[PDB]
Design a protein around this ligand. Structure first.
Ligand SMILES: CN1CC/C=C/[C@H](OCCN2CC(F)(F)C2)[C@@H]2CC[C@H]2CN2C[C@@]3(CCCc4cc(Cl)ccc43)COc3ccc(cc32)[C@@](O)(C(=O)NS(=O)(=O)N(C)C)CC1=O
Length: 155
């Protein structure tokens, strides 16, 4: 399952990078060039979403009351409720992943770093396993990179 593997790698790296503040130096697996550009895109676009919606992000986190492994496990049900049961577009996918990074940073601050990788698997599961058809039709991560591509300015 190339799409799942690639999705997991991108999502995991972003969540880990966000939580630790350090870049992972290990090579990407398959389709490395696209995965690199996807991660760079998430860095640009996800960071903005977290700031543009700072108050709501803090509010949702407080509402979820995330303390440990059991609470982190319960998030899949909530992701299905909120994300899967709605329209699909790249903006909503970025918000899914960006709030994931927001949760990962919370896990770091409460010294629950070990829950970050399971969280990343949970997000990947919801995204790929409920929206595969849409993702394929939109050209997957290549489509993601193309969608958010910014032209160089003249002059
Ligand atoms: C306009 N926006 C961004 C702003 C919305 C912020 C939202 O808060 C609204 C105000 N609430 C927070 C409160 F304090 F409880 C009062 C939530 C902050 C995270 C937003 C909820 N989640 C986050 C969520 C759901 C919660 C659990 C979760 C966990 C992980 Cl690890 C990752 C993602 C998620 C599913 O992913 C989302 C995808 C798309 C949208 C919203 C998603 C959205 O696509 C979406 O559908 N949001 S919404 O259902 O709440 N509604 C505003 C349309 C995001 C969107 O439209």
């Amino acid at each position: 399952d190339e799409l799942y593997r690639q999705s997991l790698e991108i999502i995991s790296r972003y969540l880990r990078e966000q939580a630790t503040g350090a870049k992972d130096t290990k090579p990407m697996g398959r389709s490395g060039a696209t995965s690199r550009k996807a991660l760079e895109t998430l860095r640009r676009v996800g960071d903005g979403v977290q700031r543009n919606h700072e108050t709501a992000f803090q509010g949702m986190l407080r509402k979820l009351d995330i303390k440990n492994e059991d609470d982190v496990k319960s998030l899949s049900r909530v992701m299905i409720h909120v994300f899967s049961d709605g329209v699909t577009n790249w903006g909503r996918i970025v918000t899914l992943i960006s709030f994931g990074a927001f949760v990962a940073k919370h896990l770091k601050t409460i010294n629950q770093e070990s829950c970050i990788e399971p969280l990343a698997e949970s997000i990947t599961d919801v995204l790929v396993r409920t929206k595969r058809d849409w993702l394929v039709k939109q050209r997957g991560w290549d489509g993601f990179v193309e969608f958010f591509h910014v032209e160089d300015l003249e002059g």
